[PDB]
Design a protein around this ligand. Structure first.
Ligand code: HEM
Ligand code: HEM
Ligand SMILES: Cc1cc(N)nc(C[C@H]2CNC[C@H]2NCCNCCc2cccc(F)c2)c1
Ligand SMILES: Cc1cc(N)nc(C[C@H]2CNC[C@H]2NCCNCCc2cccc(F)c2)c1
Ligand SMILES: C[C@H](O)[C@H](O)[C@H]1CNc2nc(N)[nH]c(=O)c2N1
Ligand SMILES: C[C@H](O)[C@H](O)[C@H]1CNc2nc(N)[nH]c(=O)c2N1
Ligand SMILES: [Zn+2]
Lengths: 410, 407
């Protein structure tokens, strides 16, 4: 069954056959669409089918489907599962798996880049100190002094779910949030709870507006351990504006490297609960969301005040005006310091080219419109006008509950 | 089976129960979300009629009363012999308001209960339709203090005798392809403009020509009519800060009046049912003015602001976009023509959702449509989870009648 998607700005119509490979469920029904909902131990039984599907895909991509090496590997994986209850991926299969999880990520606008991903195999890691070393090396490699490179570090897979490797941070680099007795927050309000956990575990908090959080790292189901990323490894960009000299005096900065560390990577039925990955920012992530969300740094008031915009009525669009200038400054700052960044026009335009290419050569590109359309200037980016089909392919990155909720303390 | 909806900015969680009353299908499956797709008999009528009548009588808090039953019999008597039935004035007004209440793509529904309904079911001709329409346009315009209205023509019978307004809105601007290869006026209306030419319209060939009405009664051939110019309130577009902005020659009409949809009440089909409210500013400044396939003015506007257009990363498009939208709001405000900005409209919609969850158990809403096309995340609806489902009574799209109608 073929499904059509239309771009309403160009009249380009595309045909999706890839959705027929989708197994996992969307949350939607014939009777209800959950498209705007944020979040809508395996048996040996279910594991070999999942292994088989994955390996069939892998061997098909390398043009060896049904070859002797394909049949033998299926055989070897079967036996390993029966004998040991799990299995180990080859290096080739891990790299392939990790790239495909990225390629399959519906909510990622940056996927044109999917095949250029540096994979760090951390499956020989045994301790939190070992994790910290792996992570520092990833941070250094990915940073590359501002010429950002995409990377993922993959720690050992789940076994019985009692011995998980977890990075407790949501991102490798994030700023502390501090809830004051007067109810105000200092620093990043999104990180209050995790900051509290870090302090509880013995972190001495500087209590500033931009304190880089420590890593809290869980190896082998053990209680997690604190580590401070070497600050010389943390590339930051102070934010200034090309025409507005007063912008610098707001005291804003951001870190160059976006590195998600709380997701779970599924490949051939196996579960890698610690698999931090990083790319580079789209400007709006910092300038719209991090700075301007009401529940985040919330700087709109202060910026419009300094711009002397009319703030007595929403209809002056003082908010929209400030929002643009803040985003201009973010991009100008990164560019000036030669730290890789992409504006939302360029990033969305390249996504459309990617998407079309994926249709022509793969039969589809699952894409989540709610997430792909940037959070400012939506309809002047070409994605707004693009019909998209959202469905779930494996390999995949999934959310997982925060470990402080599930972890059994020793 | 009962569903939670969360607002990620306020941590407010609402529980949706209304969705269990939904009948019609979304286009989604357990395998595939189609949330971003624009368009995804006697035995038949009576369930639909009963279902509707049941909700109507429950709403006037007289459910299971004899008057409720009495109505249920009489409808059933009528379907059995005429193969259709007629709505009472009360049922019609209620159905219309509820089709608005149920429109999951409308941010403006806080207003749903203040809708003036004009019953035009006694209309028989296109001239009749024209008169009803001019009266709607004038009542709704109200010299700039816009009021919500709907005019309802007779219902489908055998579907060979449909009433249709061929225009997509009562008021739109014409579109002309030129020898140049460029487009003059509204590119969205090129085809429809040609259809007007084809039937005798004399076109001024300007950027801003108000289209004529093309009205079909009783499934007869449609006829041309010019809305009296003095009934079409238009706003010239100027900037509170940029004196040069007037030289772009921009204007828009005050009355958004959707005229191509189909109103479904109790299984009955009202193929002509033009309705109108007032604009949210972004509809004009962002979509009408800035869509590449529309008036597409960003290039000119940026040139006049003397912004650096050498690279996307100066955000020159975004800068100009704010300005254009500031100009639309200022112009409507200075002329006292009702308009709402996207901050105010989305704030009011959040308050409306909260009301609907509280007093009705839910509110169907299409995030893709509800979130404005600029500054998405600085409006509160961006952070609001919404459940999308199809309730009846309902407004639906229907195929353009020229593809359908036989001459
Ligand atoms: C190369 C530059 C990249 C850019 C510009 C980019 C861009 C983005 C953006 C803007 C989002 C939405 C995030 C948000 O609004 O919270 C996103 C989500 C996502 N990206 Fe990418 N990305 C890049 C690289 C990568 C890499 C290397 C991976 C993994 C290998 C990845 C996987 C994902 C996933 C799984 C999501 C969804 C996250 C969630 O649901 O919270 N991206 N990306
Ligand atoms: C009173 C002020 C109103 C406001 C501010 C408003 C706002 C809007 C907006 C912004 C949209 C998105 C349209 C687009 O982006 O093309 C929309 C769609 C819609 N509105 Fe409302 N509206 C109002 C009155 C009404 C009334 C009176 C009705 C019906 C009686 C109505 C029914 C609808 C329907 C059915 C849609 C979906 C149209 C489509 O799918 O193309 N609106 N509205
Ligand atoms: C690898 C990469 C590159 C890039 N440019 N951008 C990214 C997303 C990161 C960075 N900027 C935002 C952050 N987003 C990742 C985490 N998102 C929270 C999702 C969430 C929240 C609550 C409930 C849910 F069900 C889901 C990753
Ligand atoms: C009543 C009212 C008030 C208001 N503010 N705004 C409105 C929507 C109107 C006006 N501004 C745009 C227009 N929207 C109605 C037409 N929308 C096109 C939808 C469409 C297109 C193509 C294929 C599809 F399947 C669907 C109505
Ligand atoms: C409720 C809504 O689904 C939620 O706020 C989503 C909307 N779109 C998004 N898109 C991106 N890229 N990132 C986000 O955090 C969100 N939030
Ligand atoms: C492809 C996508 O569904 C399409 O561009 C939609 C997106 N959201 C929209 N939202 C509104 N309010 N109006 C529109 O016309 C659209 N277009
Ligand atoms: Zn859906």
């Amino acid at each position: 069954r073929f499904l059509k998607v239309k771009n309403w700005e160009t009249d380009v119509v595309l045909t999706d056959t890839l959705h027929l490979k989708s197994t996992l469920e969307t949350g939607c029904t014939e009777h209800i669409c959950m498209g705007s909902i944020m979040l809508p131990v395996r048996t040996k039984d279910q594991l070999f089918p999942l292994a088989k599907e994955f390996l069939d895909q892998y061997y098909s991509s390398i043009k060896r489907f049904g070859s002797k090496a394909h049949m033998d590997r299926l055989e070897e994986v079967n036996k390993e599962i029966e004998s040991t209850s799990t299995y180990q991926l080859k290096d080739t299969e891990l790299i392939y798996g990790a790239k495909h999880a990225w390629r399959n990520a519906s909510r990622c606008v940056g996927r044109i880049q999917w095949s250029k991903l540096q994979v760090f195999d951390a499956r020989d890691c045994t301790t939190a100190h070992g994790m910290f070393n792996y992570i520092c090396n990833h941070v250094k490699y990915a940073t590359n002094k501002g010429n950002l490179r995409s990377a993922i570090t993959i720690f050992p897979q789940r076994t019985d779910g009692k011995h998980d490797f977890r990075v407790w941070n949501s991102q490798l680099i994030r700023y502390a949030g501090y809830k004051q007795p007067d109810g105000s927050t200092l620093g990043d309000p999104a990180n209050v709870q995790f900051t509290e956990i870090c302090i509880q575990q013995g972190w001495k908090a500087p209590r500033g507006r931009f304190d880089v959080l420590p890593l809290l790292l869980q190896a082998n189901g053990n209680d997690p351990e604190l580590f401070q990323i070497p600050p010389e490894l943390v590339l930051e960009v102070p934010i200034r504006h090309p025409k507005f000299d007063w912008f610098k005096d707001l005291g804003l900065k951001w870190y160059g490297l976006p590195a998600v560390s709380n997701m779970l990577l599924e490949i051939g039925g196996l579960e890698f609960s610690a698999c931090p990955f990083s790319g580079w920012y789209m400007g709006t992530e910092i300038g719209v969301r991090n700075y301007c969300d009401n529940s985040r740094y919330n700087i709109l008031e202060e910026v419009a005040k300094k711009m002397d915009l009319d703030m007595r009525k929403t209809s002056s669009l003082w908010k929209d005006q400030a929002l643009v200038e803040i985003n201009i400054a973010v991009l100008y700052s990164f560019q000036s310091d030669k730290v890789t960044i992409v504006d939302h026009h360029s990033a969305t335009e390249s996504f459309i080219k990617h998407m079309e290419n994926e249709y022509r050569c793969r039969g589809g590109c699952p894409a989540d419109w709610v997430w792909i359309v940037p959070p400012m200037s939506g309809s002047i980016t070409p994605v707004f006008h693009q019909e998209m089909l959202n469905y779930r392919l494996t390999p995949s990155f999934e959310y997982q509950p925060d470990p402080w909720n599930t972890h059994v303390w020793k």
